[PDB]
Design a protein around this ligand. Structure first.
Ligand code: CLA
Ligand code: CLA
Ligand code: CLA
Ligand code: CLA
Ligand code: CLA
Ligand code: CLA
Ligand code: CLA
Ligand code: CLA
Ligand SMILES: CC1=C(C#C/C(C)=C/C=C/C(C)=C/C=C/C=C(C)/C=C/C=C(\C)C#CC2=C(C)C[C@@H](O)CC2(C)C)C(C)(C)C[C@H](O)C1
Ligand SMILES: CC1=C(C#C/C(C)=C/C=C/C(C)=C/C=C/C=C(C)/C=C/C=C(C)/C=C/C2=C(C)CCCC2(C)C)C(C)(C)C[C@H](O)C1
Ligand SMILES: CC1=C(C/C=C(\C)CCC[C@H](C)CCC[C@H](C)CCCC(C)C)C(=O)c2ccccc2C1=O
Lengths: 69, 129, 742, 170, 42
């Protein structure tokens, strides 16, 4: 079974990074909507952080799998 | 319009009905008012024959919470008719007092419950110790 | 918010007046009958909504409410399946002895000696043995009592009433507008996320909290009435943590991303449960939980009301290269303005999925004790192959109805449809050549073998013993899947299916599954399959591609989708319509699926099913005769049809005498169909004239003048009785054979 | 306008004081969908059954006929299922309900009030005013007895004591 | 009863289904009470 670890600040770090990464990506790649202060609303923010919890969950599970944690 | 401190930082009001938001907030206010006052009330005095979070499951086995659920469920059905008919179409101080004390009750109840997780105790019981 | 709900209120009046006026829905039929053709034309065109109405809005409204009516019938059907299980079944006796009791949920009344059909199915019970696999579903669900089967029956009835109310309500009280139905992004978002995603997630929750604890206790051996009720697992988390200790930690491992804690009940075992011969339900729970996540993820792809998402029009119009002209431009407009184009896709996909279901369920048996219930394994494979084949032919039926009616060349200039129609001779000539090659090099190998075996030349045959046509690619794929556990699926413990290789799984001394070896006979019959599927594609594709026009008839679209001919000229244009290729392609579908289920039936009996005893050796039902006898036609005639028809012919006087009667009755219906297929309308009208004369002689002629059936209806009646007869013969033959021996 | 009973619920609009006993209580909006004449026929039929049932309980504990065994009313249901008098009552009720089906067709066809069977043998209803008050009282009693019925049968199940003996004890 | 609903029940398929179900039904009942009648008893 792929090893997973109990929540630590390291798990938080990956999640925070991934959420911010997607918030910046969402400002760039969301085609229909002051780098983050133009046209930024809740559906844009709620979508980029939804992909952050998808990317972050995948990254956390993968880094636990290989040993990086 | 009541209790407007210009505080909608995330701008939820832009993407959900203000009537729906106000109804949900005032319902949350009144539920948390009852819950917080009840949480302090249990430690002040006890009804005959009858602590914060595990007492939910101490009460469900009797059928108390199930009965309360049935009556809240009934009232909430007529109240869902109420909110649908709201949505499909010297006192202002008192409304603002209700909403302010209700937001305070939400903070207070959250505090008491997470205090229970910390210490396994009710609010004023911990306050005393 | 351009995605919005819009409804016309009180559109159509709930009146019985049009009930009393048969044919009210069309201008031709509403003026009443003058010949008997009117009666047949009434039933033929009734659900052809786009033939009655011009507006896409009223057509969409009729379809939406008719889908509720269909749901109401399915819920009523499901509710009755539960009630017969609750009231007229040996389910409770079967729960104690799944390997000894035969499932039975139908009891006949004693009237004309027909109570012989209440055979001794076991458990102190008499009834008709049922093969639909409901008992195995209910045990997989964790039902464990007839009381819970009554509650499921009521749950179906309440749903059945709610669907028929909604169909009435959404046609007569609150009918959505066309702009509501034309929300393809919204509908896909909800049907991926809401229907399929929350469907899987909720079912995973039932599996985890009810199916997993109840079935662990059953497979441990606890008696069904000794098992705690399904809600005591929901409340007493200590009792659930006894069976699965990961429940001691609750939902903190889920939220903190420490998912490995849940490996007690979310496994990736693979293979089968040794006790029941079924899939590990801890695997099915993880399967449905994982499927649920990516259906909820998939349902966030399309743009509805907040700028995030894809426009499906933009995706399609962007995919165009140097070979394909304007590309997928105009396909969005087709699929949001034509119901037939949507029905053509969805029928072909649903038929394909039903064919996949047949293959996946025999090979990876999902339910407890369904693998060693061989009447069920044969029944649900055969049933889902026929549903698939029928639905696939209706996909080409409605691709033809689209092309004849809903296709507009002005909106389809130089796109993928325009380009397909403009080289359809190259497509149909290449498919035609493949089908000739395939027929010669698949069925001609059988004819070579018939001749060589008849001539005494067994060294000259294509056989495992003689010249060998081995399926090396299928054997190699089988090798890879047995090597996959621990190698290319490292955390899997067993193979996806034991059909690929590996152990023999035995339940109650009967084989659940065991490796299905492939030899020359398997090479031969697989190319038989590729030939029959390609010809079926050939007949149906030629009908779709030539539906509007040919070199023969330059204006076939003006005659319609369904016309009998365009006269005896040009040498003769009989059966030139797109309807007439669906008619001819349902015969070749029948031919195709008949060989598939015959291949399945003989191979499973000969090489898979049977009994295990000391030394672990398996005695198969027909003793491994497939390898050396499925290579000749005489082997299929003798060792499959003749040898296995013994049970249905000798069934008289037993509980299987019903199958013996349906065997003969379907042979009758099939032959009777050839009266309609080989004959023509002109003979039958002239025969009717003399019969009309004798009525005129007695002053008893009818005022609705009798006619011979139309040319099309003679074809439709002939095909329907051919299918009813052909399939009904195999149904009786399959069911009496496998109930007796398996 | 707003509902008389529920102040914050709007009036249903198919309930415009046409029937006696109308307080505007219809949250589910069954009167926006279904015929109110049919619903009122059912209301009065369910209520009249409930009224005869509650009295049926009370008298059956106080007295029972000498030719029938003494026992509790739910036990009476099961005893008369197996004895034969239950089918008697079912047959004669069903017989009357045939002419009730004709009566409901007469109501749908506009020619009859929903619960009116012209059953005034003792001439108790005198004129329009006393008849309106009597039918308001009938509706109120019918609804109340429907509630009451649930209580007697359900309470007997939970505690195996009859309604009068349950008031007498505890 | 509604005259359009009675005109619907007078339609040929309903009457055909009802009459032949009624006809089938008293053959079934006659063979329940009086079974195995190969001959007119005389
Ligand atoms: C939907 C699928 C389905 C199917 C195929 C069956 C099939 C069967 N049921 Mg089951 N049943 C179902 C659902 C189903 N049932 C449901 C949902 C319930 C719960 C209410 C039941 C409850 C039930 C019981 C309680 C019994 C059966 C029995 C039977 C058997 C005999 C039925 C019979 O001859 O009665 C015939 C009854 C008649 C009144 C004959 C009616 C014939 C008319 C003329 C049909 C006409 C339809 C009409 C013309 C449509 C148009 C309407 C009009 C306005 C024009 C048969 C195996 C019996 C059995 O198994 O006995 C051992 C039995 O006792 N069923
Ligand atoms: C989450 C939202 C959602 C869900 C679940 C569905 C579900 C369905 N739609 Mg869709 N639909 C949706 C949104 C949704 N729709 C939206 C937003 C639109 C507008 C664009 C449409 C437009 C649309 C059309 C035009 C059609 C459908 C049809 C269907 C049915 C497909 C046949 C089938 O598999 O039914 C069987 C499967 C089932 C699960 C039966 C379930 C019955 C209920 C309705 C499901 C939901 C119940 C409830 C939410 C669950 C409560 C859970 C609670 C106990 C905790 C199915 C019931 C077709 C149909 O059959 O019409 C009736 C059809 O023609 N839908
Ligand atoms: C730093 C980031 C990171 C790292 C190290 C990994 C690493 C891994 N992922 Mg993860 N993943 C990531 C980000 C990451 N992923 C993100 C951002 C997503 C999007 C949500 C995913 C989604 C994802 C899924 C959905 C799955 C993985 C799986 C896997 C593992 C096996 C893949 C394999 O060999 O299949 C080889 C298979 C083949 C067919 C190739 C031939 C591997 C350890 C898989 C797994 O087994 O996890 C247990 C799996 O199912 N990943
Ligand atoms: C509004 C709520 C409420 C009220 C008014 C009461 C009131 C009462 N309860 Mg109840 N009770 C309650 C909630 C309530 N309880 C809850 C939530 C539970 C848990 C499910 C119980 C469980 C309970 C039990 C188990 C018993 C009572 C009993 C009693 C009586 C005790 C008399 C007494 O000591 O008074 C003060 C009296 C004096 C100071 C001197 C005399 C009294 C009438 C007892 C009783 O008498 O019932 C027969 C009893 O046995 N109660
Ligand atoms: C729609 C599907 C569905 C539904 C309705 C439920 C409902 C529930 N689950 Mg289940 N669950 C589901 C899917 C579902 N689950 C899936 C897919 C998984 C796999 C990840 C689980 C795994 C799971 C576990 C491991 C547990 C629950 C528990 C619970 C209960 C929640 C109690 C709680 O908040 O304290 C939870 C406890 C905390 C400490 C927080 C509740 C009955 C808990 C329970 O009561 O067990 C019976 C519990 O321990 N669920
Ligand atoms: C989701 C599935 C689906 C849907 C909604 C439709 C809907 C439609 N189809 Mg399509 N079709 C489908 C599946 C579907 N079909 C499949 C699977 C096939 C392959 C066989 C076809 C082949 C097909 C053709 C070839 C034609 C249609 C036509 C039609 C239309 C007219 C329907 C009508 O009036 O018939 C009324 C219904 C009947 C007359 C029912 C009688 C049919 C059979 C003979 C009776 C059933 C036998 C029964 C199951 C077993 C009896 C038991 C026995 C022992 C007694 C309508 C748009 C026609 C059209 O012109 O469309 C524009 C048309 O010509 N369809
Ligand atoms: C046993 C009955 C039978 C046979 C042999 C055929 C044969 C054929 N059909 Mg027909 N068909 C049949 C019944 C049959 N059909 C029925 C009942 C229907 C009713 C719906 C149809 C409807 C139908 C349609 C609608 C279509 C076909 C097509 C085909 C061809 C498939 C291509 C192929 O396999 O070429 C290989 C040829 C064979 C397998 C024939 C047997 C040859 C074997 C190998 C022995 C050859 C011996 C050799 C020539 C001897 C030479 C010496 C000798 C002269 C002395 C082929 C000509 C399709 C077609 O023509 O497209 C290609 C097509 O579109 N058929
Ligand atoms: C006038 C019409 C009529 C007739 C002929 C009957 C006939 C019968 N009733 Mg019925 N009954 C009727 C009207 C009628 N009833 C009405 C209007 C009601 C009210 C709804 C009932 C309620 C009823 C019940 C509740 C019972 C009968 C019973 C009986 C049986 C009594 C046996 C007997 O003769 O010994 C009794 C002789 C006398 C009472 C002498 C007087 C007999 C079959 C009983 C029975 O045994 O059923 C099998 C039973 O328990 N009847
Ligand atoms: C119309 C007509 C005529 C007639 C007639 C007839 C037969 C008229 C009969 C009318 C009847 C029987 C009316 C009865 C109403 C009963 C009600 C409202 C229920 C009350 C119970 C309650 C509140 C309770 C309770 C409780 C619960 C549930 C459980 C307990 O543990 C506790 C507790 C006890 C508190 C005649 C023939 C005269 C002629 C005339 O020309 C026309
Ligand atoms: C099955 C069977 C049997 C049986 C039986 C029977 C008949 C059992 C009885 C079933 C019945 C009548 C249940 C109904 C109960 C009434 C309810 C719940 C209303 C509550 C009012 C509410 C919730 C609110 C009211 C409201 C509040 C807040 C205050 C304002 C007003 C209002 C808005 C109205 C037998 C005996 C025949 C035996 C046989 O062998 C088996
Ligand atoms: C026999 C025959 C007829 C004569 C058949 C007719 C006129 C129909 C006779 C059907 C009778 C009148 C009613 C059918 C009732 C059946 C006993 C049951 C049928 C089941 C459903 C229709 C209910 C044709 O008209 C015909 C036309 C074109 C090609 C072949 C043929 C053909 O073979």
């Amino acid at each position: 079974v792929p090893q997973t670890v109990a929540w630590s600040a390291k798990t938080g770090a990956v999640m925070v990074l991934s959420n911010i990464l997607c918030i910046v990506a969402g400002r760039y790649v969301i085609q229909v909507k002051s780098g983050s202060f133009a046209g930024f609303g809740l559906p844009e923010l709620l979508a980029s952080t939804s992909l952050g919890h998808i990317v972050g969950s995948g990254a956390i599970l993968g880094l636990s799998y290989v040993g990086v944690l | 319009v009541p209790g407007d401190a210009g505080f909608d930082p995330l701008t939820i009001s832009a993407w959900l009905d203000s009537r729906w938001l106000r109804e949900a907030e005032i319902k949350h206010c009144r539920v948390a008012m009852l819950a917080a006052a009840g949480c302090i009330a249990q430690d002040i005095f006890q009804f005959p024959g009858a602590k914060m979070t595990a007492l939910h499951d101490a009460a469900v086995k009797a059928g108390s919470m199930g009965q309360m659920l049935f009556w809240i469920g009934f009232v909430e059905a007529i109240s869902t008719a109420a909110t649908i008919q709201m949505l499909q179409g010297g006192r202002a101080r008192m409304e603002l007092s209700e909403i302010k004390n209700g937001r305070l009750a939400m903070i207070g109840f959250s505090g008491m419950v997470h205090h229970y997780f910390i210490t396994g105790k009710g609010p004023i019981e911990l306050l005393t110790s | 918010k351009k995605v919005s709900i819009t409804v016309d209120r009180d559109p159509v009046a709930t009146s019985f007046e049009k009930w009393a006026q048969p044919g009210h829905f069309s201008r031709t039929l509403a003026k009443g009958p003058k010949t008997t053709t009117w009666i047949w034309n009434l039933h033929a065109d009734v659900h052809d909504f786009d033939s009655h109405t011009n507006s896409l809005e009223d057509i969409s409204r009729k379809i939406f409410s008719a889908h509720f009516g269909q749901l109401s019938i399915i819920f009523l059907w499901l509710s009755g399946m539960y009630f017969h299980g609750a009231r007229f079944s040996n389910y409770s006796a079967w729960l104690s002895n799944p390997t000894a009791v035969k499932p039975s949920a139908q009891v006949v009344w004693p009237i004309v000696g027909q109570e012989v059909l209440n055979g001794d199915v076991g458990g102190g019970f008499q009834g008709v043995q049922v093969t639909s696999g409901f008992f195995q579903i209910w045990r997989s669900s964790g039902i464990t009592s007839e009381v819970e089967l009554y509650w499921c029956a009521l749950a179906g009835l309440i749903m059945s009433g709610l669907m028929i109310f909604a169909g009435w309500f959404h046609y007569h009280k609150a009918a959505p507008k066309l702009e509501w139905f034309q929300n393809a992004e919204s509908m896909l978002n909800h049907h991926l996320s809401g229907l399929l995603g929350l469907g899987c997630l909720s079912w995973a929750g039932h599996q985890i909290h009810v199916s997993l604890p109840v079935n662990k206790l059953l497979d441990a051996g606890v008696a069904p009435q000794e098992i705690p009720l399904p809600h005591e697992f929901l409340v007493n988390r200590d009792l659930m943590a006894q069976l699965y200790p990961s429940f001691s930690k609750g939902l903190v491992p889920f939220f903190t991303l420490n998912w490995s804690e849940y490996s007690d009940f979310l496994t990736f075992k693979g293979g089968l449960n040794p006790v029941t011969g079924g899939l590990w339900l801890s695997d099915t729970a993880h399967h449905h939980l994982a499927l649920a996540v990516l259906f909820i993820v998939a349902g966030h792809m399309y743009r509805t009301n907040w700028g995030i998402g894809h426009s499906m029009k933009e995706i399609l119009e962007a995919h165009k290269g140097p070979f394909t002209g304007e590309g997928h431009k105009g396909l969005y407009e087709i699929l949001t303005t034509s119901w037939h184009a949507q029905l053509a896709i969805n029928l072909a996909m649903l038929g394909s999925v039903s064919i996949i279901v047949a293959h996946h369920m025999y090979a990876m048996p999902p339910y407890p004790y369904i693998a060693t219930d061989y009447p069920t394994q044969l029944s649900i494979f055969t049933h889902h192959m026929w549903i698939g084949g029928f639905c696939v032919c209706g996909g080409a039926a409605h691709a033809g109805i689209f092309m004849v009616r809903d296709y507009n060349p002005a909106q389809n200039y130089n796109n993928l449809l325009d380009r397909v129609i403009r080289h359809r001779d190259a497509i149909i000539s290449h498919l035609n050549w493949i089908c000739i090659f395939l027929g010669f090099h698949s069925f001609g190998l059988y004819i070579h073998n018939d001749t060589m075996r008849a001539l005494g030349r067994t060294q000259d045959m294509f056989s495992d013993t003689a010249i060998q046509l081995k399926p090396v690619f299928a054997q190699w794929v089988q090798s890879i899947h047995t090597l996959a556990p621990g190698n290319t699926t490292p955390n899997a413990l067993a193979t996806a299916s034991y059909a690929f290789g590996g152990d023999v799984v035995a339940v109650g001394n009967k084989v659940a599954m065991m490796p299905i070896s492939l030899g020359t006979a398997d090479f031969m019959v697989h190319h038989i399959h590729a030939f029959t599927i390609h010809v079926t594609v050939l007949i149906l594709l030629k009908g779709v591609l030539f539906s509007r026009n040919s070199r023969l008839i330059p204006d076939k679209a003006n005659l319609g989708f369904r016309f009998p001919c365009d006269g005896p000229g040009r040498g003769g244009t009989c059966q030139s319509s797109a309807w007439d290729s669906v008619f001819l392609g349902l015969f070749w579908m029948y031919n195709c699926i008949s060989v598939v289920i015959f291949h399945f039936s003989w191979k499973m009996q000969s090489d898979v099913w049977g009994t295990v005893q000391s030394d672990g050796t398996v005695t198969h039902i027909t003793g491994g005769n497939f390898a050396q006898s499925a290579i000749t036609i005489n082997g299929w005639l003798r060792d499959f049809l003749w040898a296995q028809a013994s049970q249905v012919i000798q069934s008289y006087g037993s509980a299987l005498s019903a199958y013996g009667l349906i065997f003969l009755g379907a042979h009758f219906i099939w032959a009777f169909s050839l009266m309609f297929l080989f004959s023509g309308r002109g003979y039958w009208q002239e025969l009717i004239e003399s019969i009309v004369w004798a009525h005129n002689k007695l002053n008893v002629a009818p005022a609705i003048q009798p006619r011979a059936l139309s040319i099309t209806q003679g074809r439709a009646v002939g095909l329907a009785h051919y299918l009813l007869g052909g399939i009904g013969t195999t149904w009786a033959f399959f069911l009496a054979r496998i109930i007796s021996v398996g | 306008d707003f509902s008389a009973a529920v102040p914050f619920l709007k009036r249903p609009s198919n309930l415009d004081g046409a029937y006696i006993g109308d307080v505007g209580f219809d949250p589910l909006g069954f009167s926006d969908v279904f015929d109110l004449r049919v619903l009122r026929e059912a209301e009065l039929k369910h209520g009249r059954f409930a009224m005869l049932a509650v009295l049926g309980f009370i008298v059956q504990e106080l007295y029972t006929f000498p030719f029938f065994p003494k026992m509790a009313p739910v036990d009476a249901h099961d005893y008369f299922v197996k004895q034969g008098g239950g089918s008697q009552i079912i047959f004669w009720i069903s017989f009357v309900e045939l002419f009730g089906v004709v009566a409901l067709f007469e109501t749908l066809q506009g020619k009859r009030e929903p619960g009116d069977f012209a059953f005034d043998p003792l001439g108790l209803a005198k004129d329009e005013a006393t008849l309106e008050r009597y039918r308001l009282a009938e509706v109120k009693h019918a609804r109340l007895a429907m509630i009451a019925i649930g209580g007697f049968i359900h309470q007997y199940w939970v505690t195996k004591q009859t309604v009068l003996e349950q008031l007498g004890n505890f | 009863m509604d005259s359009n609903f009675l005109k619907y029940l007078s339609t040929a398929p309903v009457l055909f289904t009802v009459w032949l179900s009624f006809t089938a039904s008293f053959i079934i009942e006659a063979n329940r009470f009086f079974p195995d009648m190969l001959y007119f008893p005389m």
